[PDB]
Amino acid sequence: ERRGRIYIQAHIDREVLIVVVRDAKNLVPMDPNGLSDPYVKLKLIPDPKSESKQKTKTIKCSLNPEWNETFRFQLKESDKDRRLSVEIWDWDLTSRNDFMGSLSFGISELQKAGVDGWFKLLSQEEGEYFNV
Amino acid sequence: ERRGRIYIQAHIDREVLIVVVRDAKNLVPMDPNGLSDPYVKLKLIPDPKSESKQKTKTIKCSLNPEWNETFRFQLKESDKDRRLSVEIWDWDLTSRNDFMGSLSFGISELQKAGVDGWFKLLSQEEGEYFNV
Numbered sequence: 645e646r647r648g649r650i651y652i653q654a655h656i657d658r659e660v661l662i663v664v665v666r667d668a669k670n671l672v673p674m675d676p677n678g679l680s681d682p683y684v685k686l687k688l689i690p691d692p693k694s695e696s697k698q699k700t701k702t703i704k705c706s707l708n709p710e711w712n713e714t715f716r717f718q719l720k721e722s723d724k725d726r727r728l729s730v731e732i733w734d735w736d737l738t739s740r741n742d743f744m745g746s747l748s749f750g751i752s753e754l755q756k757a758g759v760d761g762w763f764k765l766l767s768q769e770e771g772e773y774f775n776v
Numbered sequence: 777e778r779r780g781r782i783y784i785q786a787h788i789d790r791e792v793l794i795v796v797v798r799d800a801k802n803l804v805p806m807d808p809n810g811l812s813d814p815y816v817k818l819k820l821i822p823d824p825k826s827e828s829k830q831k832t833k834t835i836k837c838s839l840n841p842e843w844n845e846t847f848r849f850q851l852k853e854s855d856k857d858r859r860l861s862v863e864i865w866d867w868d869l870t871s872r873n874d875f876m877g878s879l880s881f882g883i884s885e886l887q888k889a890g891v892d893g894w895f896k897l898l899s900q901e902e903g904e905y906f907n908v
């Protein structure tokens with residue numbers, strides 16, 4: 645568990661993905677002060693023009709952010725071949741935000757069973773394929 | 777020690793920085809296969825146009841690379857206000873290489889005493905300032 649963990653809750657209502665991003669523990673420091681400014685980015689991938697994107701607020705200087713935010717996604721046919729992508733990023737003022745941890749759930753699999761618990765954060769490339 | 781450690785040897789011999797990049801342990805996975813393709817990038821910073829850049833070879837699929845490569849840098853007056861920047865990157869074929877760990881030593885401080893040992897890898901922004 646090199647990048648910490650995040651507590652996610654996600655299930656499908658009808659054709660509506662409901663995602664709850666509660667909190668995260670032991671995130672990796674990304675700033676010179678030894679901390680980071682975490683915010684989570686949710687997308688349905690593959691997504692070209694990044695048309696699905698939704699973000700939580702940014703928590704400043706914390707390696708254990710608590711967001712408690714809910715998000716709704718209106719699904720479609722095509723989405724059955726997509727994955728719910730959850731990525732944590734470190735907000736920076738004077739530079740590209742830095743990647744911190746990733747995770748993803750197959751939409752086809754969420755329709756069969758929702759999720760509610762802690763997940764180990766993976767690397768960005770790795771997180772677009774699995775969840776642990 | 778979230779990103780593992782690297783064994784560095786560096787000292788100055790009459791205006792010449794000699795850096796030995798031996799090996800690294802417990803690097804963080806950066807690829808879908810659960811590994812990474814580490815290579816170290818050495819620069820003297822600030823160095824906007826990267827005229828300083830020098831790289832080790834890339835070791836494929838390893839979180840414990842052994843490089844054993846020596847590098848020489850011809851110092852100057854100005855370099856007394858610069859730092860030796862050591863960054864490990866994960867080589868990727870189909871995408872921007874991913875950052876793995878960073879570290880830096882003040883050139884002014886190396887002139888007073890060289891280093892030879894293990895160093896904890898820091899985040900990129902953090903690594904441009906310290907060396908734990």
Ligand SMILES: N[C@H](CO)COP(=O)(O)O
Binds near residue numbers: 685733740741
């Ligand atoms: N530029 C960063 C990329 O991850 C953050 O961007 P964004 O706020 O659009 O998610």
Ligand SMILES: [Ca+2]
Binds near residue numbers: 674675742901
């Ligand atoms: Ca940062």
Ligand SMILES: [Ca+2]
Binds near residue numbers: 675680681735736
């Ligand atoms: Ca930041």
Ligand SMILES: [Ca+2]
Binds near residue numbers: 739740741901
């Ligand atoms: Ca940044």
Ligand SMILES: [Ca+2]
Binds near residue numbers: 769807866867868874
């Ligand atoms: Ca990679």
Ligand SMILES: [Ca+2]
Binds near residue numbers: 807813866867868869
């Ligand atoms: Ca790679």
Ligand SMILES: [Ca+2]
Binds near residue numbers: 871872873874
């Ligand atoms: Ca990449």
